[PDB]
């Protein structure tokens, strides 16, 4: 119930966060603005004269003899060809950048949405749980649901436990003392348990490990005694 409530609250806050942020959708807007600016400058550059007496053709061919008309038109031709070539080159560079971004988006869709990724800070910040895609006018939005630990507590820890002259290590977890008693817990969440033979394994005597402490290791079979 707590996890469901937290998820619902986070999803509800997502829409308000998107609405309130002024530059949340900046990248798509920059793409659109760059395309529009390139088109606008290409259109406006037709008005330049490039050294000719006039920029419009009809006046040039109307009031000038053909021998001078050819050389007066060549300037406009070469200037406009240069402008168009520049536009195409800028478009090629921008297309390469967009292709790299789309490759990254496809990788994120494959690894964050269709699975669970263990790569750090790839599917969002925190331990990645799952992800959701959402469409955009020229892109995609990923909603990463991740797990964040909180409310930490300090403890005294030991690497191993010496019992009956042999050393015991935890199968999965950490030896933790609350000041007086020792327990085994999982690393990412506090859930103490009795140190027994089921959740520990033995390897060697207890004089080689640095920092080994003495404690009893319970075995469920002995108390039966039947």
């Amino acid at each position: 119930k707590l996890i469901a409530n937290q998820f619902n609250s986070a999803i509800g806050k997502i829409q308000d966060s998107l609405s309130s942020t002024p530059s949340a959708l900046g990248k798509l807007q920059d793409v659109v603005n760059h395309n529009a600016q390139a088109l606008n400058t290409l259109v406006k550059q037709l008005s330049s004269k490039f050294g000719a007496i006039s920029s419009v053709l009809n006046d040039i061919l109307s009031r000038l003899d053909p021998p001078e008309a050819e050389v007066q038109i060549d300037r406009l031709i070469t200037g406009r060809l240069q402008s168009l070539q520049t536009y195409v080159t800028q478009q090629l560079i921008r297309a390469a950048e967009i292709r790299a971004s789309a490759n990254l988006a496809a990788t994120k869709m494959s690894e964050c949405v269709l699975g669970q990724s263990k790569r750090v800070d790839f599917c969002g910040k925190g331990y990645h749980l799952m992800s959701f895609p959402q469409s955009a006018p020229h892109g995609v939005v990923f909603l990463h649901v991740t797990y964040v630990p909180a409310q930490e507590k300090n403890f005294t820890t030991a690497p191993a436990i010496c019992h009956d002259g042999k050393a015991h290590f935890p199968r999965e977890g950490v030896f933790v003392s609350n000041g007086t008693h020792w327990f085994v817990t999982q690393r990412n969440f506090y859930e103490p348990q009795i140190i027994t033979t089921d959740n520990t394994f033995v390897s060697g005597n207890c004089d080689v490990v640095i920092g080994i402490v003495n404690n009893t290791v319970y075995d469920p079979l002995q108390p039966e005694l039947d």
Binding site: L25, G124, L129, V141, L143, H144, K153, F155, T157, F189
Partner: protein, 73 residues
């Protein structure tokens, strides 16, 4: 007033000794912002200082958790 920075000279902003997470980058570690009344210039602060309590037998273990949703565009 007039101030001299490794990025040039700045006129119309006063230099203060307090550091903030800056919003208008000027350069060479110098940033500017609106006080609110005047424009100030300062050096960046890279976040708060946190000296974690390291020990040879102490461990920190979380007792609760939160789940968070983050957007990527």
């Amino acid at each position: 007033n007039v101030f001299q920075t490794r990025a040039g000279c700045l006129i119309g902003a006063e230099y203060v000794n307090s550091s903030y997470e800056c919003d208008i980058p000027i350069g060479a570690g110098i940033c500017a912002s609106y006080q609110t009344q005047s424009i100030i210039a300062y050096t960046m602060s890279l976040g708060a200082e946190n000296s974690v309590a390291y020990s040879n037998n102490s461990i920190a273990i979380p007792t609760n958790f939160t789940i968070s949703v983050t957007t990527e565009i």
